[PDB]
UniProtKB/Swiss-Prot annotation:
Assembly information from the UniProt record: Component of some HBO1 complex composed of KAT7/HBO1, MEAF6, ING4 and BRD1/BRPF2. Component of the MOZ/MORF complex composed at least of ING5, KAT6A, KAT6B, MEAF6 and one of BRPF1, BRD1/BRPF2 and BRPF3. Interacts (via PHD-type zinc finger domain) with unmodified histone H3. Interacts (via PWWP domain) with dimethylated and trimethylated 'Lys-79' on histone H3.
Protein name, as recorded: Bromodomain-containing protein 1
Gene responsible for this protein: BRD1
Localization in the cell: Nucleus; Chromosome
Domain Bromo: 9-113
Location of cross-link Glycyl lysine isopeptide (Lys-Gly) (interchain with G-Cter in SUMO2): K41
Role: Scaffold subunit of various histone acetyltransferase (HAT) complexes, such as the MOZ/MORF and HBO1 complexes, that acts as a regulator of hematopoiesis. Plays a key role in HBO1 complex by directing KAT7/HBO1 specificity towards histone H3 'Lys-14' acetylation (H3K14ac), thereby promoting erythroid differentiation.
Tissues in which the protein is found: Highly expressed in testis.
Domain of life according to the entry: Eukaryota
Organism: Homo sapiens
Residues of the full protein shown: 555 to 674 of 1058
Length: 121
């Protein structure tokens, strides 16, 4: 139907905006701490601690299958990256501190993305 096509054009445009948002978020992680999944070879107990792992590569695979229906879903996954790290790692670590910085800096980007998703519809 033409209605289905139009919904698909909206999904595609959301996907384009989310890709730019994701690049901007990942620049706030110049150390690449959050680039890839936590390795189960190197942290074999990780899944006893963290139930829903997340990382930027995993987000990127989802995005390119147009798997985010809205910004809420995308923010949930970004929040998991930060929140998993701040539970698994202690306050006095390079990992926890990188999370806090990504959160603070990413909040700016997300504040305007929420306005752009609303605005462009």
């Amino acid at each position: 139907s033409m209605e289905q096509v139009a919904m698909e054009l909206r999904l595609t445009e959301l996907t384009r905006l989310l890709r730019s948002v994701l690049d901007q978020l990942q620049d706030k992680d110049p150390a690449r701490i959050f680039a890839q999944p936590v390795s189960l070879k190197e942290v074999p107990d990780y899944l006893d601690h963290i139930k829903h792992p997340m990382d930027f590569a995993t987000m990127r695979k989802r995005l390119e299958a147009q798997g985010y229906k809205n910004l809420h879903e995308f923010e949930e996954d970004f929040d998991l990256i930060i929140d998993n790290c701040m539970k698994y790692n202690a306050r006095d670590t390079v990992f926890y501190r990188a999370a806090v910085r990504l959160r603070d800096q990413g909040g700016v980007v997300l504040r305007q993305a929420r306005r752009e998703v609303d605005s462009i519809g």
